[PDB]
Design a protein around this nucleic acid. Structure first.
Ligand code: SF4
Lengths: 261, 1145, 261, 261
DNA sequence: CAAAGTGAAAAATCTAAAGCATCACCT
DNA sequence: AGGTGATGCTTTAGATTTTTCAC
C-alpha cells in the first residue's frame, strides 16, 4: 500500500536520470513522512541527498517504513517509457520484492504497469553536518553548468573563492589556467537571473571538478542553484526540485598541502 | 700497417703458447696418425715465404686420449660475376690493384640457379680472388661493398671495370664455413691425418667405417653465488662458496673454506641404476687458494669440454671479475675473452649451454626451460633447489646443503649433456661442417642454410646473395605497401572445452558416409599394405578375417549414428608435412616460375605434364597513397634540403642520404597526410594469383630432403633393430657386445633426432630476409596445399566425427569407440611375420592420393641424354600418436572468435605431454596468473564425470580467488610481493621515449622523482612496480607505484607515497591498502574466461562458478535456448511460390 | 522505357530508409498494379510487403513486368541525398545496366540525377495466405511505435493479447516485466488518434520483440497503424500510405513446444 | 603591449571553430593594420590566407608588431567558453609569455579571465598571389554544405564543371554516379539565397570532398560564400563577414592519373 | 658504427560514426 | 501542442602503438 500520486512526469524521471553516472545502487526509505536518499558515491568521496516529503504528493499512503533498493540504470531505462506530460504513480506492498509502477496517459487510454525485481543494500548512514553557511551563490544554474563544463575542457580541478570583492572560480590546467569572476546583480529586475551572495568571510579552498560536472548534469529541474559553503566544509550545491521536494549534493574539499617545502 | 702485422703476430704467438700450455701439441714430425676431431679454430701461422699467413686449426684426439692438433692454411676467396665479356680485364685490373692482398686470380665458373634459360646447359662464369688473410678480406670487402652497391644502383637506374663488377657474395657467411666445405671436412669423425713436410699441405682423409668413438674430457662445473637482497648479483660485491665438476663419469669438487664452516667428505648421487658419479673433496682455506686450485686442476686436466648452462651471462664475466679482483690474468691462465657479441669463445676448449637447446631446439615447454624442469622432463626427477634471496644465510648456517645441491646439479648437468647433447653434437657433425658453438647459438634456419651450402657445393651451384629488405614496395598500380606476409597460419578450433576419452560424450554420425567407407574398405587395406611397408597382399594370411572384423565394427557404428559413447581422442598429426608436399610437387625456389618465363623454358609442350597449376592467395596490407601523390611528395622532398643527421654539419640533401631515414620520412609524411586525408593508412585485402613451378632443375633441396627422409626411415628402422639387439644382449650380459650396441643405438638415435629437428627446420627458411632463397610463394603454396588437405579432412571427419583443432601440421580430432583404428596383419613373410596397420591414417592417405597423385614426377635418369622419365609417386603419409586420455581447448573473449594454436593434451597416465601458447610458459609479465594456470593444469586430470571435473576446477579456482578476496591477512607478504611484482623492461632510456605514456615510463618517472636520475640514467632496468587504486580520475598508466620505494625509510617512503598519491590524509600505509585490484581482477577474469568459463559455457554447463560474469552476447542465446519459444522457419507457416532470379534489367 | 514519378518524395524517402536493418537485398518488382516490394530477412524469420498504386504515381508508365533485385545500403545512402520536399522519378529500360533516379526540388533549380548499377541474385518467393484473422486494431502510429521503442529494453520477448477490454502488449526480461493496456476510443473525432478494435476469438500469442524494434522505424508513413492476427497465423501489421499504396509486414511467431505429462 | 576588445562574441568563435581542425599551427603576425593568418598546412596542398583589419574593433592598441603565433587547438579550447554576444577582451605584453583572455557578459554581470602559455615558431612567409579569376560564383552557404555532405558519403572525387548556365558536380563512386545542376537565380527576393556566377571560361577540376567539408565548417560565418577558380591554378574559397576581412583558401588541383595511357 | 625479426595479444588511448534528446520558425 | 532540419552529449567500434611472447 506504499502509495504516491503526483501530477508531474518529467521531474522524477530526470532526477533519477541525474544519478545515472554517480550512483548505481542507493537506499529509498519509503516512510510516512516521505522518501529520502543518502549515500556514499561509487568512489565514496561525496554525499548525495534527495528529499521528497508527503505533502508534495497528491495522495501518499504509507503505513510502515521500508528501505528498498534498485539498480538506478535499470529503472532509469524503465523510466524512459512515458512522456514528460504523463501522470505517475508508484506503490508497494508488505512483501514488496518488486516495485509496482504505473504510467497513465493524460487522455486516459494508454496505461502501462511496470515491475522490477529488486535487491537489498547495506550502506552506512551518517548524519549531515548542519551549521551556519558563510557563502551562498544564488545564481542561475544553467550558466553555472555552462561555465564549469567550459573550464572543464581546459582545467581538471577548480578553486572556489568567495571574497569581499566577489566570487572567484579558479581552475589551473596543464595547457592553461582560467578563473571566473561574478559580482552582485544590480540592474536586473527579475530575481531568477539575479545573483545574491550573502557575505560573511573571504575563502580560498580547493574542490574537485568532474564530480561537480556530474552534479551539474541536473540543471533543467531548477532555474537556479544555491552553492552553500563555509570554510573547510564540503560544498552544498542545492537544486530546488519543486514543491515536491529538494536535493543536496556534498562534494569533499581537496586537501592540498598548505605546508612549505 | 707493420704495427698491425706485428700486433697480429704477437697475438698469434700468445695464443700458440697458450694453446700448447693445455696440450694439443704442434704436430710437426712426418708421419700418419689416426685422428678424431673435436673442434676447429682459425689462426695465423708464418708460412714458408715470410708472409703473414692466415690458417685454421683442427683439434684431434684418439682412444688413448692423445691430444694434438694440425694447422690448415688456405687462401681466402669469394666469387664475382659481371656482364658477358667482362671477366678477363676485370681479373687483370683486380690483380694489378690488389697486390699484396690477392695471392692469385682465377676464373671459376659456377652454376646459377636464378637465371633465364634455367639449366639448359649454360654455366655462368665467375672470377675468384684468392686472398691471404681474413683481415685483408675484411678491408677489401669494405673497399668493394659501396662500389658494388652503387654498381647495382645504376643497374636499377639503367667504363672502369670496378663498375662492371656487379655482385659481392658470401660476405655475411665467414671464412670457417667455406673452408669447411672447400676441403669436404666434416667435423667430429674419425679421420686419418698425415704430415709430409712444410713444403706440402697437410693431407686429411675421411675414414668411414670406424663408427666407434671415444669420450672426450668433460667439465661440468656447478656455480653458486650469494646475492645481497635488493641487488643485482655480481662478483665485485660478494664472494664464491665452492665448485664441483665432473669428468667422463668421475667427478671432483674444490671448496673454499674461509666462509664454509665445516670440512666435507665424499658424496655419491645414484638415483638411477645406470647413473653413477664418484667424487673427491679438495678443501681450500683461501678464495685465492680456491681459484688457483681449480685452475691448476684444469691445467692437469688437459680440458676440451667445459659446460654449464648460461655461462656467457652469469659465469665467465663473473669468473674474470673474480680474477680481476685478485689480479689474476685469465687470458694467460685459460684465455677466456669476451666475444664481439657477448660470449666467451674457447680456442682450446668447448663451452656449451643447454639453454641454447632446452629453450630452443628441445621442443619442450618454453617456460619450463629451467634445469630442474629439464631434469623432471628427461631424467624425470627434479633436483633440490634454493631461493637466491636467502641462500647466503643458508650457506653460512650449513655448507652441506650447498655441497649436495651443487654435486647433484653438476651430475644432472652431465647426464643431461651426455644423454641428449653429445647426440646433438654428433648429429650436427654428421654432415654440417660447423663448430658446435655456432651450431647451438645460430638458428635452425641457419642450419638449413648450412645444409644448402653443403649440397650446393655438391651441386657446384653458386650461392645466392643474401638479399636486403627494400622499402616503398609498389603493386601493379604502383601502390605503396606497408608490410607483406601470407594468408598466415590457418589455425582454427571448432569446438572447445574438456574432452577426456574415458568420460563419455555425444556423437551424431552419418550412415551414408559409413557405406561410402564400405565400398572401399578393401581398397583402403590393400593400399595400406602395398604402399606403407611395400608388402604385397598375397603374403597376408588373415586378410579376410580383419576385413570381416572391420565390416562388423563399422556396421556396429553405422546402425545407430547418433549415440552417447566414450570419445577416442586421436591426433591427425602430419609431421614433416611441408617437405613431403615439396617432395610431391618438386618445389624449388628458382623453379618458382612465372608463365612469361615458363615460356622461356624449352618444355612448354601442349601435353602439360610439367606445369602444375598451383593457386595461392596474396594478403595485401598497404598504404592508400597513389603513384601521382607519391611523385608530388617525392618532388617536394627533393626540392629543398633537410635537417642534418650530421651534428652541426652542412644542410642535408636528398640525393646523398641513405635509404632508411628517407623511408622514415616517407612513411611519416604519407602516414599523417592520409591520416588527415584518407581515414585509414592500412587497407587489408586478399587477392588471388596463379603461378606454376618448374620441375626439371637440379632439385637439390627436393632430392636432398628426399634422401634425408629415406635416411630418416632406415635410421629409425635400424634404431628399433639395434635397440632390440641391445635388450637381448642385456639379457645376455657380455660387456663388449652391450657397450658397442649402446654405441650403435645412440648413433642411430642421434641421427633420427637430428633429422627430426631438420624436418622441423625446413619450412622456416624462407620467411626471413638475408637468406639464399627468400620466397613469397613457396611457403605460401605449400600451406595452400596443406590447407586443401586439412579442409578436406575437416569435411571428411565432419561427416565421420568432430574435428577439434586445425593446426597446420596436425589435426587434433576425436573418433567413436568402435571406429577402426589399428589392425595387425599376420603374413607368411619371414622378414615381417605380422604387419600392423592403422586404419584412419590409411584412409586419409588413400583420400589424399585419390585427390593428389602427382603424375608429373620426372627424374633425370640419364643426364647425358637429358632423359626425364615421368612417373607417379605417393608419399603423403600421416600418423596418429598414442590415444590421448585428455584434450583441453580454450576459447577467446570476443564474439565468434576463439584462441588459435593454444591447447594442451594428456597421455593415458596423465603425463604432461604437450602444453604451449599460454602465459604460464611466457616469461615475465604477471606470475600469479601463471600459478593459477599451473594449479588448474594439475587439477584437470581428476574426475570421471565432466560435471565433477568442472566442480573440482571450480573448487581450486574458489580457493585461489578467496585467497585474494580475503586480502591475505593471515598469510605472509613476501610471496604476495613476488606474485604482484609486475616488471616491464626499459628498452631505451626514460628521456628517449619522453612524451610516450606507458606504465614502464611512469614507473621510470616515479624512480626519477624518488632517487633522482641515477636510477634511470640508462636502459635495461628491471623496473618492478604495482598498480595503485586510491588515486581517482587518473589513467591506469599513471600511478604505476614501483616496488623500489620500499627501500626508503618510513618517513621518506611515506612522504614519497603522499607525493605520488596526491593525498596526505592517510596515516597507515600497508602494501595491501595501496593495491589496485581492478587491473588484477581484470587480468584474472580474462584468464579465467579464457581457460574455464567460456569453454564450459559453450559445453552446456550452467556456470563454472557464480563468482565470474560473462559477456552478454552468449547470455542472450543461452537464455533463449533454455526456453521452448524457438525460432520458426517461414516454410512451415507460410506457403511457397518458387525460386525467382533477377536478370540484367 | 519505364517511367514512374511521385509528388510526395518524402514518403518515398522514409519508406525506403525504414526497411534497412532486416534485409540487404530487396526484391522490387514492377507490374500493371503499380510497383510492389516483398522482401524476407536474411535470418529466415520475417517478411515485409510494400505495394504502390499505379495511379499513386503522378505518371506511371509500366512497359514490362520487370523485377529488380538490388542492394539496399547504398540505395538508402544515395536516397538520403534528396531533400525533404523534392519530387522523385524512377526510370528503367527494357535493356540497360543501371537504374536511373532523378531528384527535383520545388524551386526548379536544385535538380539532381543519379545512376545506380543493377545486380543479379536468385531469391525465394513466399505465398501470402489470406484468412479470417481474429482481431483488427486501428492504432495510432506514433503511440504504437513509441510502445515498440520503450518496451525494447524491459526484455527481448513480448506477449500480446486482445480482448473486449482492448489490446495489451506485455514484455519481460531478466530485470522485470512491463505491460501496456489500451482501452477503446469513442469521445474523439480524429480517427488517426482514435483506437478501435474487433474480435473473433481470444488471442494470447507472442512475437519477436527485437525484430519489431528494428522494423518500427516506419512511424510517420501512415498517421495510424492497423494490425491483424490470429493464433499460429501470420502477424499482419500494415501501414496504409494514403492512396499511394500500403506497407505490410509478416512475422514468425513463437509456439509453445509440448512437454511430458 | 597589445589590446583589443569587441562585443560580437559569435564571430571569432565560429571563425576558430572553422579553423580549429584543418590547421594545427599558424602564425599570428600582428601589424599596425592588423593580423594576417596564413598557415603552412599539414596537408601541404590546401593553403589558407586569412586577413584581419582594425576598423571593425571598438579598441585596438599595440606597441610593437610582434610576429608571434600559437596553436589553434588551444585557441579553440579557450574561446569555446565564448557564447554569441559576450564581449571578448584580450590583453598582452611586449614579451610572449602569457596571454590574457577576458569575456564580458552583455548583461554586465559575467566576467572571466583566462591565461595561456605561448610558443615560438619559425615559419617562412608564403606568398599570396592575386590574379583575375575566370569563374567566380557567389554560392549560398547552406545548400553548398548540403551538397558537399551529399557527395561525401557517395564519392571521394568531385569534379567541378562551371558553365555559362551554372556549375555541375559529378563523381565516380563504388555504388554509382550522379550530377547536381546549378544556374542563375533571378526572381528570388532574398539575396543571401541568390546565387550568381561570373564566367570567362569553363574550368574542370577534380577535388577531394571532405577537405572541402573541412572548409565548409565556416557556414555560420555568412549565408553566402564566394567560390572562385581558373584553369591550371588552385581554387580559392572566399568567406566574407561584416567589414572584418577575408579568408582565402588555396587548394591545389589534383590532376588525373596519367600513368594509364 | 653496429644489428636474424614479424604475426599475435592486449591494452591505452585516441579517435570518428552514429543514436538520440533539445531547439530556429508557425496557428 | 506537433511538423522541417541544426546542435550537442553519450556510446561504441575500430585505429594505433609499444612491449613481449611463439615460430
Ligand atoms: S614448368 Fe615445364 S615449361 Fe614451365 S619452366 Fe618448368 S620445365 Fe619449363
Amino acid at each position: 500500500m506504499f502509495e504516491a500520486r503526483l501530477v508531474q512526469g518529467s521531474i522524477l524521471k530526470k532526477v533519477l536520470e541525474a544519478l545515472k553516472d554517480l550512483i548505481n545502487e542507493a537506499c529509498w526509505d519509503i516512510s510516512s513522512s516521505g522518501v529520502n536518499l543518502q549515500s556514499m558515491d561509487s568512489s565514496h568521496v561525496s554525499l548525495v541527498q534527495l528529499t521528497l516529503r508527503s505533502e508534495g504528493f497528491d495522495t501518499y499512503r504509507c503505513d510502515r517504513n521500508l528501505a528498498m533498493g534498485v539498480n538506478l540504470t535499470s529503472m532509469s531505462k524503465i523510466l524512459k517509457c512515458a512522456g514528460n506530460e504523463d501522470i505517475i504513480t508508484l506503490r508497494a506492498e508488505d512483501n514488496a520484492d518488486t516495485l509496482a509502477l504505473v504510467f497513465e496517459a493524460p487522455n486516459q487510454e494508454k496505461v502501462s504497469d511496470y515491475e522490477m525485481k529488486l535487491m537489498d543494500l547495506d550502506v552506512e548512514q551518517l548524519g549531515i553536518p548542519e551549521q551556519e553557511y558563510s557563502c551562498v551563490v544564488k545564481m542561475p544554474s544553467g550558466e553555472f553548468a555552462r561555465i564549469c563544463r567550459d573550464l572543464s575542457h581546459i582545467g581538471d580541478a577548480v578553486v572556489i573563492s568567495c571574497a569581499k570583492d566577489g566570487v572567484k572560480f579558479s581552475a589551473s590546467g596543464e595547457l592553461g589556467n582560467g578563473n571566473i569572476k561574478l559580482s552582485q546583480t544590480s540592474n536586473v529586475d527579475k530575481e531568477e537571473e539575479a545573483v545574491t551572495i550573502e557575505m560573511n568571510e573571504p575563502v580560498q579552498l580547493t574542490f574537485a571538478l568532474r564530480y561537480l560536472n556530474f552534479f551539474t548534469k541536473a540543471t533543467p529541474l531548477s532555474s537556479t542553484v544555491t552553492l552553500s559553503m563555509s570554510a573547510d566544509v564540503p560544498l552544498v550545491v542545492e537544486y530546488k526540485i519543486a514543491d515536491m521536494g529538494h536535493l543536496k549534493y556534498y562534494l569533499a574539499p581537496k586537501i592540498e598541502d598548505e605546508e612549505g617545502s | 700497417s707493420s704495427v698491425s702485422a706485428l700486433k697480429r703476430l704477437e697475438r698469434s704467438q700468445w695464443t700458440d703458447k697458450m694453446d700448447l700450455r693445455f696440450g694439443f701439441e704442434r704436430l710437426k714430425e712426418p708421419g700418419e696418425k689416426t685422428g678424431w676431431l673435436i673442434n676447429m679454430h682459425p689462426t695465423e701461422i708464418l708460412d714458408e715465404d715470410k708472409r703473414l699467413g692466415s690458417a685454421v686449426d683442427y683439434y684431434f684426439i684418439q682412444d688413448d686420449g692423445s691430444r694434438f692438433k694440425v694447422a690448415l692454411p688456405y687462401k681466402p676467396y669469394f666469387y664475382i660475376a659481371t656482364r658477358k665479356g667482362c671477366e678477363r680485364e676485370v681479373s687483370s685490373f683486380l690483380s694489378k690493384k690488389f697486390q699484396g692482398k690477392i695471392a692469385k686470380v682465377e676464373t671459376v665458373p659456377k652454376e646459377d640457379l636464378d637465371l633465364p634459360n634455367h639449366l639448359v646447359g649454360l654455366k655462368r662464369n665467375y672470377i675468384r680472388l684468392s686472398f691471404h688473410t681474413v683481415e685483408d678480406l675484411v678491408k677489401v670487402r669494405k673497399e668493394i661493398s659501396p662500389a658494388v652497391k652503387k654498381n647495382r644502383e645504376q643497374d636499377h637506374a639503367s667504363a672502369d671495370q670496378l663498375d662492371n663488377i656487379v655482385d659481392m657474395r658470401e660476405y655475411d657467411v665467414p671464412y670457417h664455413i667455406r673452408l669447411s666445405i672447400d676441403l669436404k671436412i666434416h667435423v667430429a669423425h674419425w679421420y686419418n691425418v698425415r704430415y709430409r713436410g712444410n713444403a706440402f699441405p697437410v693431407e686429411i682423409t675421411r675414414r668411414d667405417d670406424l663408427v666407434e668413438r671415444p669420450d672426450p674430457v668433460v667439465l661440468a662445473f656447478a656455480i653458486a653465488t650469494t646475492k645481497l637482497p635488493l641487488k643485482f648479483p655480481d662478483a665485485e660485491t660478494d664472494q664464491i662458496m665452492m665448485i664441483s665438476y665432473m669428468i667422463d663419469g668421475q667427478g671432483y669438487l674444490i671448496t673454499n673454506r674461509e666462509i664454509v664452516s665445516e670440512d666435507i667428505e665424499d658424496f655419491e648421487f645414484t638415483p638411477k641404476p645406470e647413473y653413477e658419479g664418484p667424487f673427491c673433496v679438495f678443501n681450500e682455506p683461501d678464495e685465492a687458494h680456491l681459484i688457483q686450485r681449480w685452475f691448476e686442476h684444469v691445467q692437469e686436466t688437459k680440458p676440451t669440454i667445459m659446460v654449464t648452462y648460461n655461462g656467457d651471462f652469469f659465469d665467465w664475466p663473473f669468473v674474470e671479475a673474480r680474477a680481476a679482483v685478485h689480479g689474476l690474468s685469465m687470458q694467460q691462465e685459460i684465455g677466456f675473452q669476451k666475444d664481439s657479441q657477448g660470449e666467451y669463445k674457447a680456442p682450446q676448449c668447448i663451452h656449451m649451454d643447454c639453454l641454447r637447446w632446452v629453450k630452443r631446439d628441445s621442443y619442450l615447454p618454453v617456460g619450463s626451460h629451467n634445469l630442474k624442469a629439464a631434469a623432471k622432463a628427461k631424467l624425470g626427477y627434479d633436483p633440490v633447489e634454493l631461493d637466491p634471496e636467502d641462500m647466503c644465510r643458508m650457506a653460512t648456517e650449513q655448507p652441506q646443503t650447498l655441497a649436495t645441491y651443487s654435486v647433484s646439479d653438476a651430475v644432472a648437468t652431465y647426464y643431461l649433456y651426455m644423454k641428449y647433447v653429445h647426440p646433438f653434437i654428433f648429429a650436427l657433425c654428421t654432415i654440417i661442417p660447423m663448430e658446435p658453438d655456432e651450431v647451438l647459438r645460430k638458428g635452425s634456419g641457419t642450419l638449413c642454410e648450412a645444409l644448402l651450402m653443403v649440397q650446393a657445393f655438391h651441386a657446384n651451384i653458386i650461392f645466392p646473395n643474401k638479399q636486403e629488405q627494400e622499402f616503398n614496395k609498389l603493386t601493379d598500380d604502383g601502390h605503396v605497401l606497408d608490410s607483406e606476409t601470407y594468408v598466415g597460419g590457418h589455425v582454427e578450433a571448432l569446438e572447445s572445452g574438456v574432452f577426456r576419452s574415458d568420460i563419455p560424450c555425444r556423437f551424431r554420425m552419418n550412415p551414408a558416409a559409413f557405406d561410402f567407407l564400405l565400398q572401399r574398405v578393401e581398397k583402403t587395406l590393400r593400399h595400406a599394405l602395398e604402399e606403407e611397408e611395400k608388402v604385397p597382399v598375397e603374403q597376408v594370411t588373415n586378410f579376410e578375417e580383419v576385413c570381416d572384423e572391420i565390416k562388423s565394427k563399422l556396421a556396429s557404428l553405422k546402425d545407430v549414428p547418433s549415440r552417447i559413447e566414450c570419445p577416442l581422442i586421436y591426433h591427425l598429426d602430419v609431421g614433416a608435412m611441408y617437405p613431403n608436399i615439396i617432395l610431391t610437387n618438386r618445389l624449388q625456389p628458382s623453379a618458382m616460375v612465372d608463365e612469361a618465363t615458363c615460356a622461356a623454358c624449352d618444355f612448354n609442350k601442349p601435353g602439360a605434364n610439367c606445369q602444375r597449376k598451383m593457386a595461392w592467395q596474396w594478403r595485401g596490407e598497404f598504404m592508400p597513397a597513389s603513384r601521382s601523390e607519391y611523385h608530388r611528395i617525392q618532388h617536394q622532398l627533393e626540392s629543398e634540403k633537410f635537417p642534418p643527421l650530421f651534428p652541426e654539419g652542412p644542410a642535408r640533401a636528398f640525393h646523398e642520404l641513405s635509404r632508411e631515414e628517407q623511408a622514415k620520412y616517407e612513411k611519416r609524411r604519407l602516414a599523417d597526410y592520409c591520416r588527415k586525408a584518407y581515414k585509414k593508412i592500412h587497407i587489408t585485402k586478399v587477392e588471388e594469383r596463379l603461378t606454376t613451378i618448374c620441375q626439371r632443375e637440379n632439385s637439390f633441396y627436393v632430392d636432398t630432403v628426399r634422401a634425408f627422409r629415406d635416411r630418416r626411415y632406415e635410421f629409425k628402422g635400424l634404431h628399433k633393430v639395434w635397440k632390440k639387439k641391445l635388450s637381448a644382449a642385456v639379457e645376455v650380459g657380455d660387456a663388449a657386445e652391450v657397450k658397442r650396441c649402446k654405441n650403435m643405438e645412440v648413433l642411430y638415435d642421434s641421427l633420427q633426432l637430428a633429422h627430426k629437428c631438420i624436418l622441423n627446420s625446413f619450412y622456416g627458411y624462407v620467411m626471413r630476409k638475408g637468406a639464399r632463397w627468400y620466397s613469397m610463394e613457396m611457403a605460401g603454396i605449400v600451406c595452400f596445399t596443406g590447407a586443401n588437405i586439412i579442409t578436406q579432412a575437416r569435411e571428411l571427419i565432419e561427416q565421420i566425427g568432430r574435428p577439434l583443432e586445425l593446426d597446420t601440421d596436425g589435426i587434433w580430432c576425436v573418433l567413436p569407440n568402435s571406429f577402426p583404428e589399428n589392425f595387425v596383419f599376420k603374413t607368411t613373410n619371414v622378414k615381417k611375420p605380422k604387419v600392423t596397420i592403422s586404419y584412419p591414417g590409411a584412409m586419409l592417405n588413400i583420400m589424399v592420393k585419390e585427390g593428389f597423385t602427382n603424375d608429373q614426377y620426372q627424374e633425370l635418369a640419364e643426364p647425358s641424354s637429358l632423359t626425364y622419365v615421368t612417373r607417379s609417386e605417393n608419399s603423403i603419409f600421416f600418423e596418429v600418436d598414442g590415444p590421448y586420455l585428455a584434450m583441453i581447448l580454450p576459447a577467446s573473449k570476443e564474439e565468434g572468435k576463439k584462441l588459435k594454436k593454444r591447447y594442451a593434451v594428456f597421455n593415458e597416465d596423465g603425463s604432461l605431454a604437450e602444453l604451449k601458447g599460454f602465459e604460464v610458459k611466457r616469461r615475465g609479465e604477471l606470475q600469479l596468473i601463471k600459478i593459477f594456470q599451473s594449479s588448474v593444469f594439475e587439477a584437470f586430470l581428476k574426475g570421471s564425470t565432466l560435471e565433477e571435473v568442472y566442480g573440482s576446477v571450480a573448487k581450486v579456482a574458489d580457493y585461489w580467488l578467496d585467497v585474494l578476496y580475503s586480502k591475505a591477512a593471515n598469510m605472509p607478504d613476501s610471496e604476495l610481493f613476488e606474485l604482484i611484482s609486475e616488471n616491464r623492461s626499459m628498452s631505451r632510456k626514460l628521456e628517449d621515449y619522453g612524451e610516450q605514456k606507458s606504465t614502464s615510463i611512469s614507473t621510470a618517472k616515479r624512480l626519477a622523482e624518488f632517487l633522482g636520475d641515477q636510477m634511470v640514467k640508462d636502459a635495461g632496468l628491471s623496473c618492478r612496480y604495482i598498480i595503485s587504486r586510491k588515486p581517482e580520475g587518473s589513467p591506469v598508466t599513471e600511478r604505476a607505484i614501483p616496488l623500489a620505494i620500499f627501500q626508503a625509510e618510513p618517513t621518506v617512503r611515506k612522504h614519497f607515497l603522499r607525493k605520488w598519491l596526491k593525498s596526505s590524509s592517510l596515516q597507515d600505509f600497508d602494501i595491501r591498502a595501496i593495491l589496485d585490484w581492478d587491473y588484477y581482477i581484470e587480468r584474472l577474469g580474462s584468464a579465467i574466461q579464457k581457460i574455464i568459463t567460456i569453454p564450459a559455457a559453450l559445453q552446456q554447463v550452467k556456470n563454472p562458478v557464480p563468482r565470474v560474469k560473462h559477456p552478454d552476447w552468449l547470455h542472450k542465446k543461452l537464455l533463449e535456448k533454455n526456453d521452448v519459444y524457438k525460432q520458426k522457419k517461414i516454410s512451415e507457416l507460410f506457403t511457397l511460390e518458387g525460386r525467382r532470379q533477377v536478370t540484367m534489367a
